[PDB]
Amino acid sequence: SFANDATFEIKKCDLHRLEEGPPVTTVLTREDGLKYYRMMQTVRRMELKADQLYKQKIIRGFCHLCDGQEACCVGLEAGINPTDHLITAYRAHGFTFTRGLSVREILAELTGRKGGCAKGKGGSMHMYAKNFYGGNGIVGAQVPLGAGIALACKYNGKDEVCLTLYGDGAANQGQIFEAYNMAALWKLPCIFICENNRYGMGTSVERAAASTDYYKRGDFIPGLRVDGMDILCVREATRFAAAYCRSGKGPILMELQTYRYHGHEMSDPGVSYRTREEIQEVRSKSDPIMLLKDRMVNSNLASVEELKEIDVEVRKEIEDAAQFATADPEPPLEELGYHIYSSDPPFEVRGANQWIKFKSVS
Amino acid sequence: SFANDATFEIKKCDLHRLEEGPPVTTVLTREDGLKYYRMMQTVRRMELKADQLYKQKIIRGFCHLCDGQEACCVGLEAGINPTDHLITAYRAHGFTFTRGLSVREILAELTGRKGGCAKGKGGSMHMYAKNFYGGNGIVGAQVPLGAGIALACKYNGKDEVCLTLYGDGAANQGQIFEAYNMAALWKLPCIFICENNRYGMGTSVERAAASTDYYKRGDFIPGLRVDGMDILCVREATRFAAAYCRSGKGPILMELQTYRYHGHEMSDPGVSYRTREEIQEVRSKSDPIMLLKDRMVNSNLASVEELKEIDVEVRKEIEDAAQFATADPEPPLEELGYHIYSSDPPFEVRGANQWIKFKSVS
Amino acid sequence: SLQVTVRDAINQGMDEELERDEKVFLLGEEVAQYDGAYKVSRGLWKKYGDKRIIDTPISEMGFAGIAVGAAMAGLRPICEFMTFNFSMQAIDQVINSAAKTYYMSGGLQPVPIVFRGPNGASAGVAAQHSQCFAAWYGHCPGLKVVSPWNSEDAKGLIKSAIRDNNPVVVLENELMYGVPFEFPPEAQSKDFLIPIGKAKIERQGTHITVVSHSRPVGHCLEAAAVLSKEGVECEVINMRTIRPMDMETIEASVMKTNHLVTVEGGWPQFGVGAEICARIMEGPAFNFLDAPAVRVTGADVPMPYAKILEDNSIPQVKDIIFAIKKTLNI
Amino acid sequence: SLQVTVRDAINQGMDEELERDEKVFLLGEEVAQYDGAYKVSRGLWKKYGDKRIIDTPISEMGFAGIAVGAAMAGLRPICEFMTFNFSMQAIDQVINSAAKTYYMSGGLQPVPIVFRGPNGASAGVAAQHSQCFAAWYGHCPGLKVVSPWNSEDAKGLIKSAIRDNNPVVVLENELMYGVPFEFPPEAQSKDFLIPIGKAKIERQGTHITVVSHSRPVGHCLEAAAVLSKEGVECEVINMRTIRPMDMETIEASVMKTNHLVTVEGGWPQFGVGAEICARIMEGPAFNFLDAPAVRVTGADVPMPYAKILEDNSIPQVKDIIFAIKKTLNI
Ligand SMILES: Cc1ncc(C[n+]2csc(CCOP(=O)(O)OP(=O)(O)O)c2C)c(N)n1
Ligand SMILES: Cc1ncc(C[n+]2csc(CCOP(=O)(O)OP(=O)(O)O)c2C)c(N)n1
C-alpha cells in the first residue's frame, strides 16, 4: 500500500559565482523518510526536555536550544558520510546526536554527571564525538579549526570533507575572512556554513551586517543560499557542496536560512527584539518536522498513524534518558584534575590552597 | 616666460560599485607643480640618506624605506586638508614629512636622539604629528584605529575625513574586514587605502591572496584602483574620495598600485623573491619624480635647470639634517620613565632591580 | 541612605559621566537596545540615543580598535566586552595600540579610554567563560587596572576611570551585579570619585592581614566573621586597584599583624597573589612576618562544568579559614 | 666536538622530527621560500616541499586556528609566530581552542601542536616588538611552556615539544639564534631529547642560587664568573621549562645555599620571578632562606628605542651582581 519512494520539489538556491546549483527536485525513499522524521523528532523532544530540566535547575550555566532548526542538523547529516567531519558553535545538541551520541550521554552531560559524554567536565557547549569537533564557545573560533580539519583531509588524501558552521552573528568575525582566504588559496575541501536564524543574540542581521547576503560574504568563494526549514532542500544542497569539495574545486559557502523558537539561551525571553507573533507565524508556516510529516502523509510514504507511533517511541526514549541523566551520580571529586594532558605519567595539581592536591591522570 | 598652468590627461580608475569616478583631466598650476616636485624629491633623498645612516650603524632595529612610493604620500596630501586625518603602518617616513614634520626631526628620531620627533623613544616605526596617527608596527591594527578616527570626525561634525592606509600583505588581516562592516554600517567618512607594492615582506600577492583585486575586497564598500606612480592620478582620486566621504556617503576603498625599490627593510636585500631587472624596469619606466619632471618641462610649467636647482637645495637640506641627527645627543637617561601616563602627578618606575628608580612625569 | 546593587551603581556612574561630558560614549555588543547583556547599561540608549550608546557587531578586535582610534582623536569611549574571556581576540589593541602609545609618542598622543565588563568565574559557564584576567593586564605598563567589589567601589572607580586620560581596564564581576549594598549620600552625589591606586580596609584587624579583590572580598569578610567568634581578628583589605596596586597599605597592615594570606579567584601560577607575596618579601614588611605568606586561589585547572567540581575549583570560605589557621598555627 | 648555533640546533630538531613522522609539518609567515624570517627554517622547504613547509598570509588568528584544527584531526603541526608579540592576535586559539580542549572533552580530544618563535627583547625594535610572554602563557592550565637558552636546550626541547601530545609553547630568543655552542655527540643524535619539566644546573655553587631562563642565563653565568674571582660561588639554574617548572631542583639548591635571586627579561609585576618567589615562601625551602629572595627583571616601561634607554630597560650583568651582593650583604 505504501509508496516506496516519491519525488518532491525544493526551492531553487540563490547562487554566487556558480553556473548551476543543486537540482530543484529530489527523490525520498520511505526508509529514509522514516529515519529523518524520527531523527528530527528526537532532537525536538531532547531540546524541550533540556528546557524543562534547566528550569528545574538540573542544568546550569549556558543552554542554547536548537528547536526550529532541526532540518539543518538532520539534513546536513543526510548529505554526508559518517567518515566526513563537522564542527560548529555552542548550539550543538542536535549535531551531537546526529553525529552518533545517544540522548542518554547528551542529557547526562547537560546535567553534569559521570555518564556524560564529556564526563560532566564540559556541559552544554563542549561535547565531542567521532568526527565531531564540538561544540565551541568562542564566536567564530571554530571556523579556522574547520579549515584545519579540512587541511588534514587533503593532507592524508582520504577524500573526506569538513562542514564548518557559524551563525549570522559570527559572520562578522575577522578570523572567518582570514579562513576564507587560506581555504581558497589551498583549495581545502571545506564547506563554510552560515546558519542564519536572523538574530545574533539580540541583534537582528540588518543592524549587525552592512550586507545581509551571507552566502556572498566569501567574495571570491562561491556560495548558495538554502531554505533551512526544508530537510530535503538542505540534504540536496549538502550533497551538492560535498561533491563539489570532493572534486577538488576547493571551498564553498552555504547559507541556511532557518529560525530559532527559543531565545538566544535560557536567560533570554526572546521578545525584546522580536514579536511573539513573528515566532508563531514561522512555526505554523515553516516548522521543519511539520513540513516533512505533511510530505510523507500526502505522498503516502507513511501513514499519520505510523508517524504518531514514532513520536511515542521517541518520547519514551527521551524520558528514559532523562531518568538516567537525573539519577546518574556526579563525577567523583577525586577525578577533578583528570585529563589535563594526554599521554603523560600521573602528576599532582594544586587546589584552592597549597594543602589541597588533586591527582591528574591522562 | 613660463605658463601659469596647464591641463593634463590622467588614466581612468577601475571602479567597484561606483557609477562614476574621478575625472580623466586635471589642471596643474606652476606653483603646485614646483611644490610637489620639491616634496617628492625631499622624501626620496631622505630615504636614501636613512639607508646610508643605517649601513653606518647610526640607525638601529627596523628601517622601512618608501622610495618609489613618493607619489602616494605627496599625492594624498595634495588632495586633502591640513584638518583632515591620516594613519598608516610602519613605512611612514614620507607621510610624517608630508604631514608637517621636518627632515631634521625625522632623521633625529631614526638616530635615536633627543631632537627626534618622539624624543628618541619611538624609532622608525613610531612617529606622530598634527592629525597624523603613526606609524604603527602591528600589521592591520591601524585600520580599526582609522575607522575610529573617522567615527570622531562624524561625531564632531566639522566635515573632516580620515585616510586609513594598509599594505597588500595587511589586506588579509581579519580586523580589516571587521572594520569594513562597521564603517559601512555607520557610514563613517573613512577612506580605506591599500598601498599595493606587490609584496608582503617576501610573499608576492599571488601567493598570499586568493583574489588580488584589493580595491574590491571590501565587497559591499565601493572602491577604485589608482595608478600610484602618477601624482596627479593620486591627487585627483584623493579629491574624489574625500568629496565622496564629505558628502555623507560613507566609506570608500582606494587601491594605490605602486612599488618599493628597497627590500622589505634593511636586512632584506629584496632579490630572493623578485629579480633586479623587474625593479630596474619599474624605475626606468614609472618613477614618480621622473614622471612629474617630464610633465613640468614638456608643458612649459618649469625648466630643466629650474628643477635641477631644486635638487641642489634639497640635497643641501638633507645633508644639514643628517649632520644634525648624527651630532644631536641621546636623550638623558633620567627621562627613561617619562610619559607613561598623561595628566597624572609624577611617580616612580622600577628599573632592572628594586634599587633602580626612574622618575615618571606626564 | 539607600539600597543599590553593583549593577545600578555602575549604571549611575556611566549615566553621570555621559551627562557631564558630551565627548563620552559607550559601545559594545547589546549595550543599547538590549539594555545590556547583563543589564548594566539599561536605559542609557533610551536616554541618550544612537550617537552616545552604540550596539556593535560581534567583532571584538574591530570595535576595540575603533574605540582606541576615537580616543586618540579626542573622544572618550567606554568599550564593553561581554566578558573579558572575549577580550583575548582584541588584546593587541588594548596593549599595543592603547597602553604603549603615550610613551612611544614621547607624550604627544594620549588615549582616554575605558575597557569594562565581567571578569572571572561565574556559575556553570565552563572553561572558555570563567577565566580571570587580572594578572595578565596588571602585568602591562601604560595601563591602569581596577577590580571593584561592591557598589561604592563600582561607581567610584568607573567615574574615575572615565575621567582619567589613559587606558583603564575595569574588571567587573557577574555574580556581584545583583548584590545590594548600603549606598551613603556621599556615593549618591554626581561628584563621587574613588582614586585609582588606593586600597580600602574593609575590616580592621590585629591577628592577620587578608588581601583580596573582586568577589572573593566578600568571602574574606565572611571568613573574618567566623574567625572573630573564635578570638581571631582579621584585617581585610580590598585592593580595588590591580595596577598600580597599593602595596603601602598592605605593608602597613602586615607591620601590625605579622601574618599575610592572599585570596584571589584566578589561577595560581603567575597570579595576583604571587606578585603581592614577592613584593612583601622585597619590601620593608618582610621582617615583620612571623610566618610565610600563603596564597588561596582557584584550582590550577581549566574550569569544569559539574557543580561539585566547580565548587572545588574556586576558593571557598572554608579554604580561606583553613589557610589562615595554618598561618597562625591554630 | 662540533659547534652549532642555536638557530642551527632548532633547525636540526625540526628536520629530524619531520623525517621521523610524515604527519609533522611547519606553517607560518615566510617559513618556506624565504627560508625563515630569521632563517631558522632554512633549507626545509627545499627538502620537504609545499605540503610539509607552508608559507601563510599575514593572518595569525586564522593560521593558528587552522593549525589547531589539523592537530585535532591527527596531524602534528608546528605553528610559527614571527615574534610572540604577534601571537596576541591569536592567543585565543592557543588558550581556548588548544590548551583547554583535552580537559573539556574529558580526555577524548588531544591537541598535539607546537607554537614557536622569538620572544622578548631584541635590539632596537621598540615597544610593540619587545614583549616577553613567558608569564602570560605559563599562567594557563593545559599548556606546557619552555624557554631554551643554548643549542642543546633548543634542539632537545623542540624535539620533546613535537613528540608531546599536548599544546607546547616554545619561547625562543632572536639574540641567541646566532650564538654558537659546543655540541656534544649525545646532542648530535636524532634521539636527543630534553624532558619537559626539568631544570638544569649550569654551574654548581654553594653561596647563592641564581635562577633564570632564556638569554639572561648567559648573563648569570657571566656574573657568576666575576663573583667567583671574589670568593662567591653561584649555583646557576637554567629553568628550561616555564610550565610546569622544576621547583624541586630550585628548592634543593636553596636548601644548600640559603639565598636566591631570580633573573628574567620580562616586566616585573606578575612575572616569572614573582611565582618563583611565592613558591619558595610557601615551600619546604623557606626555613633555609637566610635572606629574602630578590628579583632582577626588565624595567617597568614599554621598551624605548634609543640605545642608552634600551640598555637600561633590560637586565645587565652589573644589575645581577648588584642584586647578588645586596642579597649576601657584601
Ligand atoms: C568572541 C566572542 N564574542 C562574544 C561572545 C558572546 N556570545 C556568545 S553567542 C553570541 C551570539 C552569536 O550569534 P550567532 O553567531 O548568530 O549564533 P546563534 O546563537 O544565533 O546560532 C554572542 C554575542 C562570545 N562567545 N565570543
Ligand atoms: C600581526 C603581525 N604579523 C606579522 C608581522 C611582521 N611583519 C611586519 S611588516 C610585514 C609585511 C607586511 O606587508 P605589507 O602589508 O604588504 O606592507 P609593506 O611593508 O609592503 O608596505 C610582516 C609580515 C607584524 N608586524 N604584525
Ligand SMILES: [K+]
Ligand atoms: K580613561
Ligand SMILES: [K+]
Ligand atoms: K605538541
Ligand SMILES: [Mg+2]
Ligand atoms: Mg543567529
Ligand SMILES: [Mg+2]
Ligand atoms: Mg606590500
